């Protein structure tokens, strides 16, 4: 169920090579709180790629820490697929973790990396996340 | 690189 304390979900970003503002994935529940992939070109140069939690939320007594790990699939090998660790305390203040410069984005808009396919990028992430504090008291 | 938020 949604109050499961782990799980993997993916985003597909299309029109990639296009990509100019951040992109927003769906919800995925995990401890019963929203949790998101967040990605935008940083400085063509890089890709910024990030971990979002209950960011929609007017709270600012929530928290919740987790550890979870950011990957680009490589569609024609997962042992290629890149992928970085992260360990976070998440709150209002920081709703979102993760790396501006995750990759380079000639390398991962690179027809022959085999990251890209018809202009699409696929992320994922594996977060395991604790209890929360301060949502359900 | 090192990590952060996106802001």
Known sequence: TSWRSEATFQFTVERFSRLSESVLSPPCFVRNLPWKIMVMPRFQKSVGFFLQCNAESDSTSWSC?????????????????????????????????????????????????????????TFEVFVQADAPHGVAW | SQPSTSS
């Open chain 1, 65 to 121: 820490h987790a550890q979870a790990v950011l990957k680009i699939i490589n569609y024609r090998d997962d042992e290629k697929s890149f992928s970085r660790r992260i360990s976070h305390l998440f709150f209002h203040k920081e709703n979102d973790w993760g790396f501006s410069n995750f990759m380079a984005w000639s390398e991962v808009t690179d027809p022959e990396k085999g990251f890209i396919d018809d202009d699409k990028v």
